[PDB]
Amino acid sequence: KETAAAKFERQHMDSSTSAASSSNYCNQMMKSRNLTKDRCKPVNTFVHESLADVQAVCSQKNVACKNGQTNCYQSYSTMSITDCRETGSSKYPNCAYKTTQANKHIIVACEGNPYVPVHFDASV
Ligand SMILES: [Rh+3]
Ligand SMILES: [Rh+3]
C-alpha cells in the first residue's frame, strides 16, 4: 500500500510556497491530497518547509507523543504552516475549511529506515 512515510508527505507536506496566501487554500489542498474523498477530514496541518528540513526534525528535540510512545521530535526552529479546520456548517461532499497561516514548532513521530516523520503530533 501507501507507506507511512508517503502518507505523511501526502497529508502534511506542501513545500511549494512559503505561505498559504489564498483563503480557499484549505478547500483546494484538502481536495488535492484526497482528504475529502469519503468524509471531510476535520483538522489537518500542512508544512511549508523543505522535505529535508522536516525530515531533519527526527534528530532534534526528543519528546513523548500524545499516544505515550517516545519517538516524537519537536523542531528546534519554528516552521511556516497552514492549519486547516472544517467550518461549523461544512457538510460532505461540499467540505469547507478555514485556512489559518502560522509560524510554529512542529512535533512529529519518526520511524523506519530512513528515519523520517510518519505522524504529525502537534504544532506548538
Ligand atoms: Rh498518524
Ligand atoms: Rh496515521
Side-chain angles (χ1 to χ4, degrees):
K1 31 148 85 82
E2 185 173 42
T3 68
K7 181 169 170 188
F8 177 93
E9 287 188 46
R10 172 177 56 88
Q11 293 199 139
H12 302 301
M13 292 296 311
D14 182 22
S15 302
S16 101
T17 185
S18 77
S21 57
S22 173
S23 57
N24 207 45
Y25 175 82
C26 286
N27 291 332
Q28 295 164 11
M29 292 274 66
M30 296 297 287
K31 189 199 164 87
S32 295
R33 299 312 180 87
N34 291 336
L35 308 181
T36 62
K37 239 171 66 162
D38 309 317
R39 68 187 278 278
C40 317
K41 182 177 204 253
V43 178
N44 189 65
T45 302
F46 292 103
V47 185
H48 310 312
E49 299 297 337
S50 69
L51 182 61
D53 279 1
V54 175
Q55 290 175 154
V57 175
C58 296
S59 57
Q60 299 175 14
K61 181 163 182 30
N62 188 219
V63 299
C65 310
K66 175 187 208 262
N67 70 9
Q69 292 176 348
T70 59
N71 63 314
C72 282
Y73 294 86
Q74 180 160 271
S75 66
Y76 293 149
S77 305
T78 65
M79 287 188 176
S80 169
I81 65 172
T82 300
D83 282 331
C84 296
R85 181 169 292 249
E86 178 174 30
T87 70
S89 43
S90 175
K91 303 275 211 175
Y92 177 85
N94 306 105
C95 294
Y97 294 88
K98 176 65 169 76
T99 303
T100 314
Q101 177 67 201
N103 287 277
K104 293 174 71 182
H105 311 266
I106 67 173
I107 305 183
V108 294
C110 300
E111 201 167 23
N113 192 22
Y115 191 67
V116 299
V118 294
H119 177 84
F120 192 89
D121 212 47
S123 68
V124 300

